[PDB]
Design a protein around this motif. Structure first.
Motif: not given
Ligand code: HEM
Ligand code: HEM
Ligand code: NA
Ligand code: NA
Ligand SMILES: [O]
Ligand SMILES: [O]
Lengths: 713, 713
Positions: B684-707
């Motif tokens: 997640y700290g790599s130069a190619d990962a900013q978009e991946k980080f945002v999308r992965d974050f949204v997925a996990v945020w949504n997961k927790v919202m729906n537990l």
């Protein structure tokens, strides 16, 4: 917290089969590393690595201004964990960055090497794996210092958790041989599968065997450990002398100054270890092994100075500043440069294990030839370095990028190119019907295909049915493969092939490798049919047949299964219980616990046992594909007891009448004993499971048939 | 084989987050247990269970010809591992059939009970889980013996490996208190999260505390353990007296006759344990606990005899044939039947812990009321039995089948049914625009929604955002929730709701529970926008608002986080290091290691820390959703050291200038230290990962919202 391991330390451990789940992987389940690598600008990565070699960081200053030596050792250690016995270890999964390897004493300060590579790893992201980067960095180090490498292949996918490997039973890092968990017995016989002389070492002790500075005895350990890493005498000398042309060791003060390895260090050290209280703790004051040797007059350039010094001087036993045994050149001038101070120079020095290359008679001959002919030395070292760092990459089809060497090497177990049209689905149907009309039985067809495909191991990606090496030495003669039965099956299959191929147009033909697999597929289909189920077993053509001359018979030896629970086979009596050996085989086959359970239960009732043993054949309809193994195993109307003759064989008797119903081994009965395996057996043994059992069996049979099929990847 | 655990026994264990993967599960990842259960003929299963009760098997003959008592104890033990502190244990995953619980001493001979159920499990297959079967069998045993149950719900999915639970640190089964790993300190204070007095017991020691037969002191342990299992004094008395109306204990001879527990036994034992050399080893000669007590004159029928005997006699301390302490009725006739021999009869007997129901003053009043009013005893025991055996099933929406009680119970944290149209996507857009126009900040909106949703724990499926209980006592007052800031956010949200709802037709309205979650989603969207990304965060409406009266404030206490690494929160100083507490919280949230990593990195930079602490806030653009946490953490230009004032806080200083750049806790720095977590952070700290980080974050945020969203499951 007291764990199941603490309560029942001898119970079988299934967790090893459930590693590498998609849960632990941060990449999408869609991520394809090969495709990411194929778009990497490898040239740009190498230019960055080139610049890094002479850009010293003050937190770990570069010896002589050049990190090349350190990086060579890093890549060498990444590769040098490899053992031929099981194919485990090696550079192929970048396991040096995880426990335990990251904290082995032999890997001291390679934490610093890895950290120096973080900025490049960060820049390139997922397009270059750590595992590939470690090896590449080694190659760039060599090239930057004037050495021409034989080539480089990408494609080592990163992993995300420690591999479960047996590295030894010692409870003390570097414990000397002969303790209560001694890895040696008899006349210094190293226990299989181990390939190092002490826990936490890569190969041997650089002071000599158990610290005894005798180069002749050290040569013995070198020879044994390197052989167990797939290297012969020529490759060994080339590698050691080649490596030790560069850089230096680090022993500037007492070892007691060195603190905790990375896994023990405090959180603030941020994954680094071996923090040293000796002077600046780094650079000119570095302590790594405790030895203080610099081998050549140009440590940052390729030369043939290692052998000039080895043979040009006589050597005297001495001690480093940390107290380690090492050797110094008698009456030499101070000709070796200092790593930090341009006004200091030092005499030539050597390790005990370096001197082995001169004082072992067989090494001495090779070392003299390399001394007299440095071009031969360079070419041998290049080839050996390629082999070493790619030994666990598997078939050539997995090699990526623009530096892959075009020369095909015998150690690669090469498979010829396919130069003709492949059979289609209708051809596959015709061949299956012909196989079955020949009179080959389900048992013969299944057993032969199993024997051919189940040599694969995911650890170094060697083996599998591609190549049709089951027909060649040594596979054709392995006892597990039933050499006489195998010969008669292969002769009938070859007659089928010859007729099918003779009848075709357009040059379409079928390999014996493919036909062996297809014929086993026909056996499984027929077994399903014998049970009242119509199924099509998947089949993917495209294997080719290798020749005897393309097969190194000695290298092939380590793939012989001396234990194969799936055929209820044990070649002899072992210290490891048979069920542990089963789980070890399942892991090598890349199987999960459910896949192992289904596969074993099905093989039993298909007739796959070596020698037609009845052990675990819990069915009255042998050669029909049913869940009978599980229903009968789990039937509480049967009582099991070990036999008087053999405590590892059990009789299953009717509880009411005392009548003998079955016999089984430990490998059979473990599925009714172990609480996780019995939970799996119950699923397959339930009244609603016959169709599921058939489908799941077919899927895992197909998975095993395709394990080496990287050509379809 | 020496393992990572042996080398570095204090290192963090991430395997607990990667359990229950599809690798270990033999069902397809498509398998839906609820749908399979829905098609089970529950009536047919119960008829078979009724038949089983009096079908005695010779390998474990039924006491009094009826297995009801054994099966009641089996079901009770299945449920009785439950702890309110973390929600772990309980009947909900059928963990009694795996290590270690299958081999606890308190579960002795329950291996026989489970094996008696194999033919029924087999017959019905995947349509009834072991987990459901164990409880159902308990119910049928009660019904068979004349007791009407309150109800039964299916839906406990089976699991396929042992749950990782902390059961205590003792290294000796049943160790008495005060040892080197004592679970007791001070004035008999039991350590959280434990809920039993000795390792390997369900609750208390039936001889009395540490084997001391004092019923008043035993009562104290009973009260404390049962409270920690969610049972008050009335439920406790009802359960113990209800249970011990049936069956008997087993102690026919010395305990030395009993062999290895199931996980230690020989393979030939086929999963069973405690093989006894005492006489026939079973039936009349059975040895289970070592106690020899039969409580009633009709052990196979519901009666009011428990309390008649408890109060009807005076009790004398005596010893079973195995030497255990127990009580016999002074001068009573031999009125209790023998389990096997119709010519023998016995005096009434009791355990120490049974006598507690009379000699503890508070229990005595309840026990007398139950004795005088058997109807109240019946209904209290039926209610308590239902609660005990369903406590970990989660929201009512997971209860399956035709015996589910219609009465809604307070302990279920009930959610009102939704009786109105829900908001649609246009409504969701309008509410998020109004939320953002209100002036509530990213930090406020994220922190509030995190506080609401992150109460969920997958161990007993309590908590989560449904219900809007964050607005009620006690959640509104919890320190981790920042009560003053919380109140201001909720006031503004409530105003938005009231205006939106006031403007609707057709009775459409939005709950506060939904709005809290939707508002957090707006915060995340806004944060993404602040970073230059265009992102829609998924939202599923349908939560309802529970009232205060529907929220038991005392039961809600155990969900208070004293540790929440995701908000860099620790309420006090603990014996468990903070990073262990983080992984614990991640496990209860059902997160994998990569999910935990992404989520925590994102929350840090969004302003979710309690008290607006700067610890781990490694960004200069707070409230923008970026991967800055990772890039800055992994920056080798910074050196970290613990502070003088507090060894658990660290300062990160520029390596060249010594300038202070950041501070962090152990929860922050572990992501840069632990070798598996740092491999995740690197992705997640790599130069190619900013978009991946945002999308992965949204997925996990949504997961927790729906537990807790089992209404949608
Ligand atoms: C008998 C087998 C071998 C032994 C016992 C051995 C031992 C050692 C030891 C003890 C060090 C010093 C570590 C330190 O204090 O920094 C070292 C350094 C080194 N070894 Fe080996 N080695 C062996 C084979 C090899 C091979 C096969 C290679 C590569 C082809 C290699 C390459 C190097 C390099 C480049 C260094 C220098 C590291 C630096 O400059 O920091 N060695 N070796
Ligand atoms: C203070 C709490 C409790 C203690 C210390 C306790 C202890 C015991 C012991 C030691 C046994 C004998 C095991 C054997 O030797 O076979 C037993 C049996 C039993 N207990 Fe409990 N118990 C407790 C609570 C409960 C509860 C809550 C239930 C059910 C609601 C229950 C139901 C049973 C039954 C049915 C048996 C008879 C087993 C048979 O007939 O084989 N007990 N109990
Ligand atoms: Na390997
Ligand atoms: Na639970
Ligand atoms: O090395
Ligand atoms: O019990």
């Amino acid at each position: 917290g007291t764990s199941n391991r603490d309560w029942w330390p001898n119970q079988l451990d299934l967790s090893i089969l459930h590693r590498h789940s998609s849960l632990s992987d941060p990449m999408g389940k869609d991520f394809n590393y090969a495709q990411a690598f194929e778009k990497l600008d490898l040239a740009a990565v190498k230019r960055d690595l080139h610049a890094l070699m002479t850009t010293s960081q003050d937190w770990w200053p570069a010896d002589f201004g050049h990190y090349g030596g350190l990086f060579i050792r890093m890549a060498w250690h990444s590769a040098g964990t490899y053992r031929t016995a099981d194919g485990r270890g090696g550079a192929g999964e970048g396991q040096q960055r995880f426990a335990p390897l990251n904290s082995w004493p032999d890997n001291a300060n390679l934490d610093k090497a890895r950290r120096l590579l973080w900025p490049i790893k960060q820049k390139y992201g997922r397009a270059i794996s750590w595992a590939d980067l470690l090896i590449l960095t080694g190659n760039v180090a060599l090239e930057s210092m004037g050495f021409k490498t034989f080539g480089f292949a990408g494609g080592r996918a990163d992993t995300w958790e420690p591999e479960d490997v047996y590295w030894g039973s010692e409870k003390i890092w570097l414990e000397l041989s002969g303790g209560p968990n001694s890895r040696y017995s008899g006349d210094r016989q190293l226990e299989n599968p181990l390939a190092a002389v002490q826990m936490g070492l890569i190969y041997v002790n650089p002071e000599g065997p158990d610290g005894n500075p005798d180069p002749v005895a050290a040569a013995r350990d070198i020879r044994d450990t390197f052989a167990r890493m797939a290297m012969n005498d020529e490759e060994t000398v080339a590698l050691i002398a080649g490596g030790h042309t560069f850089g230096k060791t680090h022993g500037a003060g007492p070892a007691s100054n060195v603190g905790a390895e990375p896994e023990a260090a405090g959180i603030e050290a941020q994954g680094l270890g071996w923090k040293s209280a000796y002077r600046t703790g780094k650079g000119a004051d570095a302590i790594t092994s405790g030895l203080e040797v610099t081998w050549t007059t140009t440590p940052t350039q390729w030369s043939h100075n290692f052998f000039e010094n080895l043979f040009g001087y006589e050597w005297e036993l001495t001690k480093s500043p940390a107290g380690a045994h090492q050797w110094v050149a008698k009456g030499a001038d101070a000709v070796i440069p200092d790593a930090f101070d341009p006004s200091k120079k030092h005499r030539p020095t050597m390790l005990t294990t370096d001197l082995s290359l001169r004082f072992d008679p067989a090494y001495e001959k090779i070392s003299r030839r390399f001394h007299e002919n440095p071009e031969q030395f360079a070419d041998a070292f290049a080839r050996a370095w390629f082999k070493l760092t790619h030994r666990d990459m598997g078939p050539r089809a997995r090699y990526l990028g623009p530096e892959v060497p075009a020369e095909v090497l015998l150690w690669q177990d090469p498979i010829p190119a396919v130069d003709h049209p492949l059979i289609d689905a209708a051809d596959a149907a015709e061949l299956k019907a012909k196989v079955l009309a020949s009179g080959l039985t389900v048992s013969q067809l299944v057993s032969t295909a199993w024997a051919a495909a189940s040599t694969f191991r995911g650890s170094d990606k060697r083996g599998g049915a591609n190549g049709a090496r089951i027909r060649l030495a040594p596979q054709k003669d392995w006892e597990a493969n039933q050499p006489e039965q195998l010969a008669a099956v292969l002769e009938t299959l070859e007659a089928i092939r010859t007729a099918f191929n003779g009848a075709q147009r357009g040059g379409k033909q079928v390999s014996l490798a493919d036909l062996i697999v297809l014929a086993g597929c026909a056996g499984v289909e027929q077994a399903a049919k014998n049970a009242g189920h119509a199924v099509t077993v998947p089949f993917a053509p495209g294997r080719a047949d290798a020749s005897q001359e393309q097969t190194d018979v000695e290298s092939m030896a380590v793939l012989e299964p001396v234990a194969d629970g799936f055929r209820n086979y044990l070649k002899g009596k072992y210290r490891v219980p048979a069920e542990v050996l089963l789980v070890d085989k399942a892991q090598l086959l890349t199987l999960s616990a459910p896949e192992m359970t289904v596969l074993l239960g099905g093989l039993r009732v298909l007739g796959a046992n070596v020698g037609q043993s009845r052990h675990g054949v819990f069915t009255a309809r042998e050669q029909a594909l049913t869940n009978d193994f599980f229903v009968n195993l789990l039937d509480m109307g049967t009582e099991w007891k070990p036999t008087a003759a053999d405590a590892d064989v059990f009789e299953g008797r009717d509880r009411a009448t005392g009548e003998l119903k079955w016999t089984g081994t430990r490998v059979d009965l473990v599925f009714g004993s172990h609480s996780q395996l019995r939970a799996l057996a119950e699923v397959y043994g339930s009244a609603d499971a016959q169709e599921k059992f058939v489908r799941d069996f077919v899927a895992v049979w197909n998975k095993v048939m395709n394990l080496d099929r990287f050509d379809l990847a």
